[PDB]
Structures are given as structure tokens and as C-alpha cells.
Homo-oligomer: A and B are copies of this chain.
Amino acid sequence: EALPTHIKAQVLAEALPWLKQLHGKVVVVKYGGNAMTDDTLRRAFAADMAFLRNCGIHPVVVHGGGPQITAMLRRLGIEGDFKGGFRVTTPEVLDVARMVLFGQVGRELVNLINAHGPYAVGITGEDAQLFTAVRRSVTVDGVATDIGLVGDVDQVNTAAMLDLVAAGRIPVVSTLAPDADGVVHNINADTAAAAVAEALGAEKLLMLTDIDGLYTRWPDRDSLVSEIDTGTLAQLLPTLESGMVPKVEACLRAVIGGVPSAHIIDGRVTHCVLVELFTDAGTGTKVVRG
């Protein structure tokens, strides 16, 4: 209210280059962290999805739900663990993971976005075979370890996916997918978002995180980088904290696969999506090909 009108006009006017770049384009947004627990942040995130939609941009939301899965497994008395930052997934764990991600977490996000209109539609790789999985192992200090029904996205039905977007819908993706034999696997949502971004030819991949950005020499807070190329970023990979490794592996996968830029942004900031896309604050970390 206190802000003079000519200043508001200038903020709107400065969005124009970014509206032109994104009009009619796909933007994949990986949604997770505390941005899915704080109620103000969640409603702002959903409003930003409706914002993109009402500018003619095509958002695609890919969500996680690690803590919600862990909580439900505890409530049911199912003992489990993690190893490479991935959840060890028995058939029993997979059923719970799928039921929490698609039947609880994805449902809340669909309903939050739909307070703005008939846009959000929940999907998994199972639906219309929209994408498939291949079982993956993880490295426990150089040795490859079986962790059950954990997968990487293998193939994606680009055409059917873009058909949802053509109808004016915002796909909300829960990261489960069948392999070639129909066995459904749990996929880390960061890696799935990168696979979807590459497959759909997205103009950008946004990854919400609970951090200011990428630090090259953590915990040295002077090591924070606003922009980095994939060559330099791949060298940091052995050095990074285990919590960032999927975020970086996803950025590398997307940008090496042709997505013009991927962005690690602070999901703790209200309207972080609008800040990243329509402002030139230099905030977060931008990854480009190099």
C-alpha cells in the first residue's frame, strides 16, 4: 500500500523480457521441502502456478514427499532406511510411497492450485503409460547396491504429456512409474523432474530447495554461486553434501540434455517462483551448459 504507483509500474514493466521468453513454453517446477509444509508458502506456490497459467506459460509440477512417506511408514510400523539418498523400497514400501505421494501429497497440491480454476490434474507414470522406469542401484562407497524398487525415468510420452498442457491443464506429477514388465518403482522426484524437463523440451527447470543456493566450498558461506556451468558443476559433485547430490545430478541431466537453464532456488521465500522467473535479482543458482 505504501509503495508508490510508479514503482509498481516499473516492477511490472521489467517482467516483460521474461514474459516474452516464457510465453507458450513449458517450465518444469520441482516442488518440495518446507515450501510444501508452510501454509503461506504453499498457497503462494499454487498462486504462482495459476499466475504462469494466466500468462500463457505452461507449468508442469513435479513433487516429492520424503518426510510424508517416512511418517506414514512409521505410523504403519514398517521399518525402512535410506542409502544413497534414495529410499530402500520393498513392495510394501512402494505401496505406501505411492499411496502417500499420489493419494495425499499430490492431492493437496492439486486442490491448492484448483482454488484458482480448473487447471491441475494429478498423474503418475502409470497413467496412460506417461513414463516408464528402469531399476537403479546406488553407490555405497564405490560398490553398487540393490535398494529394491527404486528407478530412474527411462522413457517419457512427450506427445501425450503436451496434450494435457494443450488443454490448459497443469500436470501435477507423482514420481512413480512402471518398468517394462509393469513393476512400479519409486523415483526420486528431482531426477524425475529433470527427465520430464528434458523430454518436454522445457525452457527452464526450477528446483525448490531449503537453501540459499549452491555453495562450492560448504560451509564457507562466501562460496555461494549465482551461476555455474555444467562442466564446473560436475567437478563439485564428489564434494557436495548428500542432500544436494540429487539437486545437482538433476540440473546436470536437464541442462546437458538441452534444457536452456536449470535453477536451484530458495523454497523458503514466499513467491520464490515469481522472483526467479520475472525478476533479475541474481538469487538462487542458475546452471547453464558449458
List residues of A whose CB falls within 8 A of some B CB. Answer: 3, 5-13, 15-16, 19-20, 23, 44, 47-48, 50-51, 54-56, 75-76, 95, 98-104, 107, 110-111, 114-124, 126-130, 157, 160, 163, 167, 169, 178, 182, 184, 269-271, 274-275, 278-279, 281, 283
Contact = CB atoms under 8 A, between A and B. Distances in A.
A7 B274 CA distance: 11
Number of copies: 6
B123 A128 contact: no
Interface of A is mostly: helix
Contact of A12 (B11, B54, B121, B126): B11
A23 B54 contact: yes
B13 A271 contact: yes
A270 B50 CA distance: 28
A111 B54 contact: no
A18 to B, nearest CB: 9
Nearest to A274: B12
Contacts of A98: 103-104, 107
Contacts of A104: 95, 98-99, 103
